[PDB]
């Protein structure tokens, strides 16, 4: 046993920061390194040796992950008696696992735990609802039980003139779960070349969501180009907007469709996610952000047709800062993807002030894992962003030839708020553009969602292929009556603003 | 003045002994250059409606003005069916407003171009039946949204010479009874190669329009291709081979499939294509029971069209009223970039070569409704999906494209006896004209309580010839689904790869 609490973990992290980084894990055995995802996920932990097996009337239990594939960090695991503030280490032993000890090619296999996952009544040994695995990455599910997007303890150099640094959770301490409890507490040591951290997660496993109360203290070993707080990681391959990568049986493929920001000044932003041809970074200035999230608001199975991944059942993630974070940017990185496996969306909070060796930080935030975020704009909300050819009347698209003029059609569909009561008074879109002009601007009632479509044709004013930034909110009798739609469009090359008639 | 169906047949017979009157005179500029918007703004005088005088009428009729490509003078006659006496309704300028100034304001001899019928409570708007253009007509069910068309007749739609479009040159309307939602219109069909006498008994029912059609046809000339009970639709973008899908609309089509109930009782589901190159298929049959172009995806969210409402557009079912013998269901698919080209043609072509002097009589019923009146009692195709293969579902590589080129097919089945069949073993029976079906899976789809058949098509030949495919489900020795019939267009060999543009 040893003395353990959050204060001791902070000293540990602080003291670790004054010693040289332990460095990258040793390479795995080849049987583990070359192991397929299907083989990796078939590894069987001995349910009789579950972390909380000895707790009467337990509503939660926990098991560990084996090292394998890219998961090569030994993670040290401890049980904490919260009454006595005493931690005991749980030692890896091979007998805890089956189907871990032969490779893809049957070749027979020091090792350790790679992470943990938590199960809930009524299924204490299957269908885990929280999981920590790989670097500082974790995920949770809601009542659909379907895993989608990830969070991380921290992001470092995700978008800068040098390679991303991935911090690792190197140790977790589990408070022994109480009888009847659907909340558990886990402490984590974060360790990286640039930075150490002490984390406390108080994790609420509710009927329809997981709520994590996160507290961290960070201690910078080195100058850092980019510090990303409360990082989220998702994937967008094909949605309703700029469908360049949609050649599958699935009308849409994504773990999230949008970035949602509740700003320091009280403004709501809806930023539809892109799968761009070229790597893209955006930084959104804010001061005391109230919340931000990567949201999956299209719940319609018929929009995905995925009976393996169930994208339509995947959760939203909402970050709620528990203090004033001051000046900084919401960073959004969008990687070009051809499919599903690449985590091509990253979002984080980057404080304004440049990070120096010896800097300390303390952040508190709540994570909400659920179909809907816990808060949304009370005004009209963007339901979907659609793009395609413009330069013709809806209902009368020419079949005999392509449109004579090149333009890109935008349809932004709004629902909820006070659209019903406002419509008779007159609803106007307020559209600003970094380039081009919005023509044939229409405000059209959409009976099947009881909503309004703002449709316009973007005509280029420049041959430039620079990203085109767009903002739109609805006004009525001198008030904003919708959240702000913020879009980034990639116009084609000049010689591609025309149609090849291949028939 | 004396008129009945016997007299119409003598007229069409005698017409056929004379040379074709030829194509209509060109229109004045005012009318020739109208946009659809300007043409659809032409206003008929509702006070001069055809049955304005009929007490408690549940139907009324108005006429169309000439305009755009609607150049044929169509003569219109009122028939008292009680007395068999007909009087011509003469065209007058006074019957129309917004007909006499062009899109460029230029100020406007002429006739009627067609007719439309209105149903209580909207006797002057939102028409449910319309005859306009050549021998074309449409009807709507209880959505009241227009979609696909039918024609009286098709000639040379797909041959080594230009299509010939027969025209309806005259219509005779039985005066409607009070309370009746059925009307009778007779039509004279006139074309270079052929004349006809048509009788339509048109039932404007609560949820559908049913048309009892009888014709008598008289061939002036040899005919390379006679098309009986032709239908005409549009398929731009669906779930299958999505080459023309660059709009805000996940799908655009008036129909998604050809459904055939064959003489031997087989049900075929043939998903429609928007091919890169003009395509024709002839489906051999003998005494066909029914065939139709169906719009079975009714989900607004799958089209997002708040102008055309594709999801509200009707299916059209042809039910022969006799044994039609040997022949083919013709299907032509024209490449389209949009909505306005009627890129889908379907008709019955009798086996026997048509000769100058030949006469024919066909009886068929037309059902205009969301669903056809009959469907396969076994499992049915809900949808046909295509995309990249060569990877596992849920694990499509994002770091790179699949290493191997294959086309993935997903055929979703619903209904019949799948529930009871499932624990006994469902097997797909797949046949291909070329290539190989691999990673064949049968998968439960909880949300539609149905089964997906998924397979990856790997090519065996450099050929870019069309690849024909068939699939039906079998369980313990029995067919338990309709027959899926697909035509696939493999890319050129040096396009059987993915360019990594990022
Ligand atoms: O009994 C009961 C039951 O059972 C059953 O059975 C079944 C089962 O069930 C179960 C389940 O659950 C489970 C889960 O599962 C799930 C899955 O998952 C999976 C995953 O997936 C996913 C993914 O994601 C993930 C990840 O991964 C990834 C990676 O990542 C990484 C990172 O990355 C990063 C990056 O980095 C990179 C780089 O990149 C670069 C960059 O950087 C730059 O910028 C650029 C410029 O351009 O470039 C690029 O490229 O690179 C490099 C190379 O060089 C590398 O190295 C690196 O890495 O970056 C970026 C930026 O920043 C970012 O963003 C990213 O992130 O990184 C890190 C560090 O290093 C690491 O750590 C990581 O990992 O990546 C890779 C590459 O790229 C890729 O590929 C991958 O993918 O991972 C993470 C961590 O861990 C996580 O968080 C995530 O999530 O993907 C996607 C998206 O994208 C998504 O969506 C997915 O989801 O994956 C993994 C691996 O593989 C594994 O582990 C797993 O498993 O999935 C599926 C599909 O989707 C689903 O469905 C599921 O669900 O899992 C969990 C754990 O996690 C567990 O716990 C559970 O359990 O399911 C269900 C429902 O929910 C449940 O309930 C159950 O439980 O399942 C299975 C499947 O699995 C099957 O098999 C079976 O069957 C039965 O059936 C029944 O009956 C019963 O009842
Ligand atoms: O419901 C609710 C509401 O609404 C309304 O109502 C109303 C209505 O309205 C509606 C609208 O409608 C409109 C329409 O639309 C539609 C369309 O369709 C139609 C058509 O049109 C077309 C045309 O047609 C024609 C034909 O054609 C044919 C072809 O032929 C041609 C050629 O082609 C060629 C071929 O042949 C070959 O094979 C190839 C080789 O590759 O090539 C190609 O190219 O060409 C030539 C030149 O060069 C020419 O000439 C010819 O023509 O063929 C094919 C094959 O066979 C076939 O298929 C086709 O069909 O032809 C004939 C003979 O001549 C004629 O007659 C006709 O016309 O065409 C054109 C060109 O392309 C186009 O553009 C167009 O579009 O028409 C017909 C007759 O009339 C009919 O039936 C139909 O329908 O389209 C689409 C499809 O695609 C659809 O969807 C639509 O719908 O249009 C019209 C014109 O413009 C007008 O008038 C109308 O109005 O629509 C809208 C949108 O969608 C909707 O929404 C609505 O609804 O209407 C009615 C009437 O009809 C009335 O009554 C009503 O009222 C309102 O508002 C209310 O009321 C309601 O409630």
Numbering used by the authors:
A (entry chain B): 42 to 150, 155 to 548
B (entry chain A): 43 to 150, 155 to 548
Sentences from the paper on this structure:
Most Gram-negative bacteria synthesize osmo-regulated periplasmic glucans (OPG) in the periplasm or extracellular space. In this study, structural and functional analyses of OpgG and OpgD from Escherichia coli revealed that these proteins are β-1,2-glucanases with remarkably different activity from each other, establishing a new glycoside hydrolase family, GH186. Furthermore, a reaction mechanism with an unprecedentedly long proton transfer pathway among glycoside hydrolase families is proposed for OpgD. The conformation of the region that forms the reaction pathway differs noticeably between OpgG and OpgD, which explains the observed low activity of OpgG.
The D388N mutant was used to determine a Michaelis complex structure of EcOpgD because this mutant displayed the lowest activity among mutants of acidic amino acids conserved in its homologs, and this residue is located in the long cleft of the ligand-free structure. The complex structure was obtained as a dimer by co-crystallizing the D388N mutant with β-1,2-glucan. The substrate binding site is formed as a cleft in the ligand-free structure, whereas this site forms a tunnel in the structure of the complex. In EcOpgD, the seventh and eleventh Glc moieties from the reducing end of Sop13 form skew boat (1S3 and 1S5, respectively) conformations, according to the puckering coordinate system of a six-membered pyranose ring, Cremer–Pople parameters. A water molecule (Wat1) is located near the anomeric carbon of the seventh Glc moiety from the reducing end (3.5 Å). The angle formed by this water, the anomeric carbon and the glycosidic bond oxygen atom is 168.17°, which is close to 180° and suitable for the nucleophilic (in-line) attack of the anomeric carbon. The other Glc moiety with the skew boat conformation has no nucleophilic water because the O5 atom of the twelfth Glc moiety from the reducing end occupies the position for a nucleophile. These observations strongly suggest that the position of the seventh Glc moiety is subsite –1 and that EcOpgD accommodates a Sop13 molecule at subsites –7 to +6 as a Michaelis complex. D388 was identified as a general acid catalyst candidate because this acidic amino acid directly interacts with the oxygen atom of the glycosidic bond between subsites –1 and +1. No acidic residue directly interacting with the nucleophilic water is found in the complex structure, unlike canonical anomer inverting GH enzymes. Overall, a nucleophilic water is likely activated by D300 as a general base through the two water molecules (Wat2 and Wat3) and one substrate hydroxy group.
